[PDB]
Enzyme design. Structure first.
Site, PDB file in Angstrom:
ATOM      1  CB  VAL A 151      -9.470   2.502  -5.056  1.00 42.77           C
ATOM      2  CG1 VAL A 151     -10.383   3.002  -3.909  1.00 42.77           C
ATOM      3  CG2 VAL A 151     -10.278   2.251  -6.400  1.00 42.77           C
ATOM      4  CG  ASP A 152      -8.478   7.473  -2.021  1.00 42.70           C
ATOM      5  OD1 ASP A 152      -7.595   6.574  -2.161  1.00 42.70           O
ATOM      6  OD2 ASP A 152      -8.281   8.363  -1.166  1.00 42.70           O
ATOM      7  CD  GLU A 242       1.227   7.140   5.249  1.00 44.81           C
ATOM      8  OE1 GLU A 242       0.807   7.147   4.101  1.00 44.81           O
ATOM      9  OE2 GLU A 242       1.042   8.084   6.068  1.00 44.81           O
ATOM     10  CG  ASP A 265      -4.750  16.282  -1.926  1.00 41.22           C
ATOM     11  OD1 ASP A 265      -5.339  17.118  -2.664  1.00 41.22           O
ATOM     12  OD2 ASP A 265      -5.296  15.651  -0.987  1.00 41.22           O
TER      13      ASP A 265
HETATM   14  O1  LIG Z   1     -14.085   1.846   3.266  1.00 42.27           O
HETATM   15  C1  LIG Z   1     -12.934   1.727   2.730  1.00 42.27           C
HETATM   16  C2  LIG Z   1     -11.786   2.255   3.297  1.00 42.27           C
HETATM   17  C3  LIG Z   1     -10.530   2.080   2.650  1.00 42.27           C
HETATM   18  N1  LIG Z   1     -10.433   1.362   1.427  1.00 42.27           N
HETATM   19  C4  LIG Z   1      -9.192   1.073   0.651  1.00 42.27           C
HETATM   20  O2  LIG Z   1      -8.082   1.500   1.493  1.00 42.27           O
HETATM   21  C5  LIG Z   1      -7.330   2.498   0.786  1.00 42.27           C
HETATM   22  C6  LIG Z   1      -6.765   3.519   1.861  1.00 42.27           C
HETATM   23  O3  LIG Z   1      -7.851   4.259   2.506  1.00 42.27           O
HETATM   24  P1  LIG Z   1      -8.108   5.763   2.203  1.00 42.27           P
HETATM   25  O4  LIG Z   1      -7.938   6.006   0.712  1.00 42.27           O
HETATM   26  O5  LIG Z   1      -9.467   6.097   2.807  1.00 42.27           O
HETATM   27  O6  LIG Z   1      -6.917   6.511   3.039  1.00 42.27           O
HETATM   28  P2  LIG Z   1      -6.534   8.052   2.767  1.00 42.27           P
HETATM   29  O7  LIG Z   1      -5.791   8.106   1.377  1.00 42.27           O
HETATM   30  O8  LIG Z   1      -7.865   8.884   2.642  1.00 42.27           O
HETATM   31  O9  LIG Z   1      -5.729   8.490   3.969  1.00 42.27           O
HETATM   32  C7  LIG Z   1      -8.423   3.140  -0.106  1.00 42.27           C
HETATM   33  O10 LIG Z   1      -7.791   3.757  -1.216  1.00 42.27           O
HETATM   34  C8  LIG Z   1      -9.115   1.932  -0.619  1.00 42.27           C
HETATM   35  O11 LIG Z   1      -8.289   1.151  -1.503  1.00 42.27           O
HETATM   36  C9  LIG Z   1     -11.597   0.779   0.910  1.00 42.27           C
HETATM   37  O12 LIG Z   1     -11.573   0.212  -0.145  1.00 42.27           O
HETATM   38  N2  LIG Z   1     -12.830   0.986   1.546  1.00 42.27           N
HETATM   39  O1  LIG Z   2      -4.047   5.950   7.295  1.00 41.76           O
HETATM   40  C1  LIG Z   2      -3.318   4.990   6.532  1.00 41.76           C
HETATM   41  C2  LIG Z   2      -3.534   5.454   5.094  1.00 41.76           C
HETATM   42  O2  LIG Z   2      -2.587   6.544   4.954  1.00 41.76           O
HETATM   43  C3  LIG Z   2      -2.605   7.146   3.612  1.00 41.76           C
HETATM   44  O3  LIG Z   2      -1.747   8.268   3.502  1.00 41.76           O
HETATM   45  C4  LIG Z   2      -2.179   6.136   2.525  1.00 41.76           C
HETATM   46  O4  LIG Z   2      -2.074   6.720   1.201  1.00 41.76           O
HETATM   47  C5  LIG Z   2      -3.220   5.021   2.625  1.00 41.76           C
HETATM   48  O5  LIG Z   2      -2.799   4.006   1.740  1.00 41.76           O
HETATM   49  C6  LIG Z   2      -3.245   4.378   4.064  1.00 41.76           C
HETATM   50  O6  LIG Z   2      -1.926   3.842   4.356  1.00 41.76           O
HETATM   51  O1  LIG Z   3       0.902  12.475   8.674  1.00 38.16           O
HETATM   52  C1  LIG Z   3       0.525  11.365   7.837  1.00 38.16           C
HETATM   53  C2  LIG Z   3      -0.868  11.641   7.267  1.00 38.16           C
HETATM   54  O2  LIG Z   3      -0.749  12.771   6.425  1.00 38.16           O
HETATM   55  C3  LIG Z   3      -2.016  13.238   6.001  1.00 38.16           C
HETATM   56  O3  LIG Z   3      -1.813  14.337   5.160  1.00 38.16           O
HETATM   57  C4  LIG Z   3      -2.682  12.165   5.172  1.00 38.16           C
HETATM   58  O4  LIG Z   3      -4.025  12.574   4.975  1.00 38.16           O
HETATM   59  C5  LIG Z   3      -2.773  10.918   6.047  1.00 38.16           C
HETATM   60  O5  LIG Z   3      -3.381   9.870   5.368  1.00 38.16           O
HETATM   61  C6  LIG Z   3      -1.429  10.406   6.550  1.00 38.16           C
HETATM   62  O6  LIG Z   3      -0.561  10.015   5.476  1.00 38.16           O
HETATM   63 MN   LIG Z   4      -6.414   7.137  -0.333  1.00 37.84          MN
END
Ligand SMILES: O=c1ccn([C@@H]2O[C@H](COP(=O)(O)OP(=O)(O)O)[C@@H](O)[C@H]2O)c(=O)[nH]1
Ligand SMILES: OC[C@H]1O[C@@H](O)[C@H](O)[C@@H](O)[C@H]1O
Ligand SMILES: OC[C@H]1O[C@@H](O)[C@H](O)[C@@H](O)[C@H]1O
Ligand SMILES: [Mn+2]
Length: 293
Positions: A151-152, A242, A265
């Site tokens: 969602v972010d 993941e 990103d």
């Molecule tokens: O407090 C939280 C933590 C995670 N998420 C959901 O879990 C997904 C993956 O977490 P996040 O985006 O924090 O992972 P990142 O992309 O930062 O690694 C988020 O997009 C949200 O859909 C949520 O809704 N609330």
């Molecule tokens: O840390 C696990 C997270 O890793 C991120 O890269 C991915 O976009 C998220 O959906 C969640 O899988």
């Molecule tokens: O190494 C895997 C990781 O890579 C980072 O760049 C990302 O923030 C994480 O969410 C996870 O996907």
């Molecule tokens: Mn995310």
């Protein structure tokens, strides 16, 4: 049954001219890798509109992540499957915090209330169980394909029927040029997510995958079951859902792979020439602040 396409006038594909010479556009198991310049979206739109395709989009907005829904949904309306039937499913612990976003014709939104877990890891990992629970009746009767995203994020450019296939993952924008030993797969044999150093095709992202409902129910059920085995063994994979998704896609090859156009990103990685479009991108955020009360 598929009806005939209508007459269409478009540029002739030239066999002795590739669409893209700078990138791999097909995997070794003959799954397209979806980049700009590889598809004629008018032909694809015809094919999928003749089928009256309905696409479900799942998104979790738990705790503070409800703040990302306004931009996610408003930009989805500009860019995601426009012209096609779309059903958004917003999973949230705060139904009253879901913004009132105006939708185009033939698009609908449902709010599914779910519990919040304390740890961001659990919130992210438990999406697989939650999606599979909802495949198991609701999605099967309501949509043809499911797209499951973080969602972010915001849409900045076209994301359409070019992605639809029985099973797809998306190349992580940090790793698409990396050799496999550099991938951050789970490397502990004690985890169900374990991938040895000499295995692996790509590093796929947890934030964007999908397929037919049947294939997405398979993937999410298998990942949830594997996470449960790890929990019982007292191990949590290095990159959570993941890591499990990567193991599943290694052993069950996807029928299309999306290029990093589809989850980029720009703040961390800029805008390389190999990306002709940035379609769906990370919204900047402070992990520590947004993931904790
Ligand atoms: O407090 C939280 C933590 C995670 N998420 C959901 O879990 C997904 C993956 O977490 P996040 O985006 O924090 O992972 P990142 O992309 O930062 O690694 C988020 O997009 C949200 O859909 C949520 O809704 N609330
Ligand atoms: O840390 C696990 C997270 O890793 C991120 O890269 C991915 O976009 C998220 O959906 C969640 O899988
Ligand atoms: O190494 C895997 C990781 O890579 C980072 O760049 C990302 O923030 C994480 O969410 C996870 O996907
Ligand atoms: Mn995310």
């Amino acid at each position: 049954f598929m009806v005939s396409l209508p007459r269409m006038v478009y540029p002739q594909p030239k066999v002795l001219t590739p669409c893209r010479k700078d990138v791999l556009v097909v995997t070794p198991w003959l799954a397209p890798i979806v980049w700009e310049g590889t598809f004629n979206i008018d032909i694809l739109n015809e094919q999928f509109r003749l089928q009256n395709t309905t696409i479900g989009l799942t998104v979790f907005a738990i705790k503070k992540y409800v703040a990302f829904l306004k931009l996610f949904l408003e930009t989805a309306e500009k860019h995601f499957m426009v012209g096609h039937r779309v059903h958004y499913y917003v999973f949230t612990d705060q139904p009253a915090a879901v913004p009132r976003v105006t939708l185009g014709t033939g698009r609908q939104l449902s709010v599914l209330e779910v519990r919040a877990y304390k740890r961001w890891q659990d919130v992210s990992m438990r999406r697989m169980e939650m999606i599979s629970d909802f495949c198991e009746r609701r999605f099967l009767s309501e949509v043809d394909y499911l797209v499951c995203v973080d969602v972010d994020m915001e849409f900045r450019d076209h994301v359409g029927v070019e992605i639809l296939t029985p099973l797809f993952g998306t190349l992580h924008p940090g790793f698409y040029g990396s050799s496999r030993e550099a991938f951050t797969y789970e490397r502990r044999p004690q985890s169900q997510a374990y991938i040895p150093k000499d295995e692996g095709d790509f590093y796929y992202l947890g934030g964007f995958f999908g397929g037919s409902v049947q294939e997405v129910q398979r993937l999410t059920r298998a990942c949830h079951q594997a996470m449960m085995v790890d929990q019982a063994n007292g191990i949590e994979a290095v990159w959570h859902d993941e890591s499990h998704l990567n193991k599943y896609l290694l052993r069950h090859k996807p029928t299309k792979v999306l290029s990093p156009e589809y989850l980029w990103d720009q703040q961390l990685l800029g805008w390389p020439a190999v990306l002709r479009k940035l379609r769906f991108t990370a919204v900047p955020k402070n992990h520590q602040a947004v993931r904790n009360p």
